[PDB]
């Protein structure tokens, strides 16, 4: 199948309450596999999936060093960004970074990413070319100039096309029991009277992995997008995800409504109706 490896990082300043807290997590697809928190008693990169546990002490030491160094660079960056934006030392600010790689079946890079946000807003992003940058504003252009001078894009390209994809390939093999298993959704329709005149039909998808899914309602074969309440896909806590879609159905219309489900674990899309 196609797969991704992504690392997420957040630093949040807390002036007068010590130094910014740094949290980073790594995922393969929708599976968390490593975490680091500078507020832990003994900050270290820690395993969160069984298939990464086999990595030896050299891996954990190296990864922990990288994380600790990123926490420090982020703290310097948060000080720099106060300058760039002419901000006071008094407020809490946020610095985010996501990077990683997407691959297809053969493991070659399909797309790489390396991007940053400040105070919840895009700041600077490596373009798909892995050679040029998109800066959001004149502050980020100052970073762009520095990163062009230092040939940072070239460094990222080398990692994203090389090591990123090679780690992902290793992890997919070591984690082949889980990372290479799709769990299809368990689906059903429920009916919830609202008044004499109408009732909700709710189409459920439970127990699925990965998170990507499409769930829609039609009436007489017409998509009901504007009239559908579609909740965000949500974690169950057992690796799997859940989602539902609901429509308000006038009395007697129930058999005109069909729920449609698409997921990688389903060889064909499903159609379901309320079964009284």
């Amino acid at each position: 199948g196609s797969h991704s490896m992504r690392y997420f990082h957040t630093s949040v300043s807390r002036p007068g309450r010590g130094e910014p807290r740094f949290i980073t997590v790594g995922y393969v697809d929708d599976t968390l596999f490593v975490r680091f928190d500078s507020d832990a008693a003994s900050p270290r990169e820690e395993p969160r999936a069984p298939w990464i546990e086999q990595e030896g002490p050299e891996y954990w030491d190296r990864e922990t060093q990288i994380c600790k160094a990123k926490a420090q660079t982020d703290r310097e960056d948060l000080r720099t960004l106060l300058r760039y934006y002419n901000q006071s030392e008094a407020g809490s600010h946020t610095l985010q970074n996501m990077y990683g790689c997407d691959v297809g079946p053969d493991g070659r890079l399909l797309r790489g990413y390396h991007q940053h946000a400040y105070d919840g807003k895009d700041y600077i992003a490596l373009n798909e070319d892995l050679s040029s940058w998109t800066a959001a504003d004149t502050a980020a252009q100052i970073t762009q100039r520095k990163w062009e001078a230092a040939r940072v894009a070239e460094q990222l390209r080398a990692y994203l096309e090389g090591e990123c994809v090679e780690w992902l390939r290793r992890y997919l093999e070591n984690g082949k029991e889980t990372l290479q298993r799709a769990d299809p959704p368990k689906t059903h329709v429920t009916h919830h009277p609202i008044s004499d005149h109408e009732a909700t039909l709710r189409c459920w998808a439970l127990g699925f992995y990965p998170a990507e899914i499409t769930l829609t309602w039609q009436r007489d074969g017409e998509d009901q997008t504007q009239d559908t309440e579609l909740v965000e896909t949500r974690p169950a806590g057992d690796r799997t995800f859940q989602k539902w879609a609901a429509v308000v159905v006038p009395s007697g219309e129930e058999q005109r409504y069909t729920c449609h489900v698409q997921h990688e674990g389903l060889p064909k899309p499903l159609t379901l109706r309320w079964e009284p």
Partner: peptide, 9 residues
Amino acid sequence: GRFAAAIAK
């Protein structure tokens, strides 16, 4: 495995 270089903004 992570990207290892420290890059300042």
